[PDB]
């Protein structure tokens, strides 16, 4: 159908760290700057880990969360500082 437009991927960009570029892929996969990565990924600020072992969760600082973009159910949590 033409009335069926789902989300495939989402791209996150953190100018605070390297001006990097995270990418949540159509699976539960993540790819920083082209490089696939094993979870967890404790860098300084951002943590990426599974939740139920079937869904990724980004957490930059204490003012940002995310959720799985595998089959297209992205979420965000923005704290009142924004």
């Amino acid at each position: 159908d033409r009335d069926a437009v789902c989300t495939r991927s989402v791209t996150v960009r953190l100018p605070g760290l390297h001006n990097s570029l995270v990418k949540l892929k159509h699976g539960a996969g993540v790819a920083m700057d082209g490089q696939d990565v094993q979870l967890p990924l404790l860098k300084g600020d951002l943590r990426i880990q599974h939740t139920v072992t079937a869904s990724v969760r980004l957490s930059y600082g204490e003012d940002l969360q995310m959720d799985w973009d595998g089959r297209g159910r992205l979420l965000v949590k923005l704290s009142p500082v924004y």
């Binding site: 791209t11 960009r13 570029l21 082209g34």
Partner: protein, 478 residues
């Protein structure tokens, strides 16, 4: 290959810089302020840094237009949204800050559109506070109320009753006419303009009411209040998701528990939480009829409304159409359908889009009976699509504060040199008006008001009933 055009120059990915933002991040006028992803450039030919692409033309200056409704606007051009003008100076629209005049409504039997804009469903059968000012920590000037009977299920039943309580008064209306049970003190602000299909009704500097003689209640307020009111229409603050603050000072999520907080009689019946569904009672398990109603409510999305659909979203006014005329058992009067579309056409008229949607096989609205009392058929009354509501008459010769630009209905039109009076149904020459001009100055046609209360020594009163050039003597206090 193709040597690209003169106005732009080709790029090459350097092997060192990862930031090869070249062909992939082609900056057009949309995506300049927006930030772009890029892996590496391509073997394309991109405009210089000082200019951008614009519909197969690398427009040089940063003068490219400012889009709205998917339409071009050159820099300097203006747009009129609401009561504000707005001109995209550089590349962003630059609007004024004159807040406009809000408007409740009662679209159909059981729906309500707040000031800030929130349609919700509330079928009730008691009397309810539509809007008031005595809210928390305020004086409490006006207390417009509304009251319905047999109106939980829309039908040819559900006549509304409206009791408005301003300046210690009690003027109320039902069954077509308006009735004064208690006249109010400052009669100067009072006014009634029975023009067309409506009863326009002013009450002050910053209050007005409209009534289509059948169900609709469109109270209009000015900039004066700005979070001084509350009721079923909300608080008039701009915030659009706090219009469910009940009387007990908390936001609720279910509107059927909201309006139950605003009933006057605290011992009548509170309405029942209906199980939610896309099909009302008649359209429940009658999927045949459910399509004949859906199609007929697509007049709201038709060739004649295409101009307004770009300004006013019809999706709110369509949900009301399917809801009302399912529940309504329309037999002789197809008014539970013809009144939900007129409510959309009038909103389209306020934004300057007059519409003629009404034909002989759909909601006819004749106007021939007013041209009957005279044996000679002069034929001045006509159905006019949207005519001005605030004109000059023998009863209201001066121009009034006009909250409504134009209105539907039967309008009397005759050649100039004649002015309309309502008692004698036809239009008549100006001299036949009972007009008053005492001691020279221009004013109304002899309003029944006692001017000059302020100063005793300057108590020089001059009434005028219809024509008399008289002045009355003041009774001294001593």
């Amino acid at each position: 290959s193709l040597s690209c055009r003169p106005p732009m120059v080709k790029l090459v990915c350097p092997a060192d810089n990862l930031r090869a933002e070249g062909l992939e991040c082609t900056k057009t006028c949309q995506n300049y302020d927006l930030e772009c992803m890029s892996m590496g450039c391509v073997s394309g030919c991109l405009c210089p840094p000082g200019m951008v692409r614009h519909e197969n033309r690398c427009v040089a200056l940063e003068r490219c237009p400012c889009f709205h409704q998917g339409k071009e606007y050159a820099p300097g051009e203006t747009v009129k949204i609401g009561c504000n003008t707005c001109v995209c100076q550089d590349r962003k629209w630059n609007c004024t800050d004159h807040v406009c005049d809000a408007t409740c409504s009662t679209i159909g039997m059981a729906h309500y559109l707040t000031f800030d804009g929130l349609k919700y469903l509330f079928p009730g059968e008691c009397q309810y506070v539509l809007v008031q000012d005595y809210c928390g920590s305020n004086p409490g000037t006006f207390r417009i109320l509304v009251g319905n009977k047999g109106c939980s299920h829309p039908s040819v039943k559900c006549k509304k009753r409206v009791t408005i309580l301003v300046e210690g008064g009690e003027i109320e209306l039902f069954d077509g006419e308006v009735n004064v049970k208690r006249p109010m003190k400052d009669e100067t602000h009072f006014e009634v303009v029975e023009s067309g299909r409506y009863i326009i009704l002013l009450l002050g500097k910053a209050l007005s009411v409209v009534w289509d003689r059948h169900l609709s209640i469109s109270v209009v307020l000015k900039q004066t209040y700005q979070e001084k009111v509350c009721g079923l229409c909300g608080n008039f603050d701009g915030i659009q998701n706090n219009d469910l603050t009940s009387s007990n000072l908390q936001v609720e999520e279910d509107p059927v528990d909201f309006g139950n907080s605003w009933k006057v009689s605290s011992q009548c019946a509170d309405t029942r939480k209906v199980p939610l569904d896309s099909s009302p009672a008649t359209c429940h398990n009658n999927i045949m009829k459910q399509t004949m109603v859906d199609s007929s409510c697509r007049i709201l999305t038709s060739d004649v409304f295409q101009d307004c659909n770009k300004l006013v979203d019809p999706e709110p006014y369509l949900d009301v159409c399917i809801y009302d005329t399912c529940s309504c058992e329309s037999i002789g009067d197809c008014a539970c359908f013809c009144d939900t579309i007129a409510a959309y056409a009038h909103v389209c008229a306020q934004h300057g889009k007059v519409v003629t949607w009404r034909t002989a096989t759909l909601c006819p609205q004749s106007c021939e009976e007013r041209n009957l009392r005279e044996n000679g058929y002069e034929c001045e009354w006509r159905y006019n699509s949207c005519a001005p509501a605030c004109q000059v008459t023998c009863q209201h010769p001066e121009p009034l504060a006009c909250p409504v630009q134009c209105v539907e209905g039967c309008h009397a039109h005759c050649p100039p040199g004649k002015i309309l009076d309502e008692l004698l149904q036809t239009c008549v020459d100006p001299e036949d008006c009972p007009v008053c001009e005492v001691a020279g100055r221009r004013f109304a046609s002899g309003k029944k008001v006692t001017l000059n209360p302020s100063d005793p020594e300057h108590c020089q009163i001059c009434h005028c009933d219809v024509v008399n050039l008289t002045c009355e003597a003041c009774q001294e206090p001593g």
